[PDB]
Design a protein around this ligand. Structure first.
Ligand SMILES: O=C(O)c1ccccc1O
Length: 203
């Protein structure tokens, strides 16, 4: 989470499930179609709280055109897809999910957006709220197990990949259409909310 931390970091971020703050921010700047950004996350729970889910949501902001033709924040947002998986076999939760749809679902609980994500996602990972549960134990969500041992197991490692989708479409003038986004930038924040077994955010 630290501002001085290298943006091209190999280490998996450690998210503390006791929840001082729990976010991950990333700037989408100076990119071109086909570029990818990867990050691993590990959930730590050194007090062993009784955590049922870890609910992820997306927010965005600070769009800037920076001289590209596109001045729409959402159109730029819509050029990126996210893949989220858990390992500990790799359990795919989200596969190339459009970030604009992921935003409207997880931020707004927009039903039409949720329908687009529901094309691909296993509903086992969907919360009521429109947020995605990313906390698994061997690829199964905690509520699939028959209670919790005295000390709860560590949740599986999370791996995320954001890609700038590469259309390759040209227009009537022979120009690459996604060149409207040239120079554009935008900021994303992925939030992670641990919940109690009653579904409430941990206090
Ligand atoms: O820091 C990153 O590059 C990153 C990449 C994918 C998902 C979340 C992130 O913070």
């Amino acid at each position: 989470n630290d501002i001085k931390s290298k943006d091209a970091t190999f280490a998996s971020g450690t998210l503390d499930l006791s929840a001082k703050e729990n976010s991950a921010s990333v700037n989408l700047s100076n990119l071109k179609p086909g570029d990818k950004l990867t990050k691993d996350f590990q959930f730590e729970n050194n007090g062993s709280l009784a955590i049922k889910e870890v609910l992820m949501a997306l927010n965005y902001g600070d769009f800037k055109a920076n001289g590209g033709s596109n001045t729409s924040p959402e159109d730029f947002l819509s050029q990126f897809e996210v893949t989220l998986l858990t390992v500990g076999p790799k359990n795919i939760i989200l596969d190339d999910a459009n970030l604009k749809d992921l935003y409207l679902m997880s931020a707004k609980n927009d039903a039409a957006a949720a329908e687009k994500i529901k094309k691909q996602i296993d509903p086992k990972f969907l919360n009521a709220s429109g947020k995605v549960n990313v906390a698994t134990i061997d690829g199964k969500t905690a509520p699939e197990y028959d209670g919790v041992p005295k000390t709860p197991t560590d949740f599986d490692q999370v791996q995320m990949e954001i890609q700038f989708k590469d259309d390759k479409t040209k227009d009537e003038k022979g120009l690459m259409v996604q060149n409207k986004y040239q120079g554009n930038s935008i900021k994303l924040q992925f939030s992670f909310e641990a919940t109690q077994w009653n579904g409430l955010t941990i206090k």
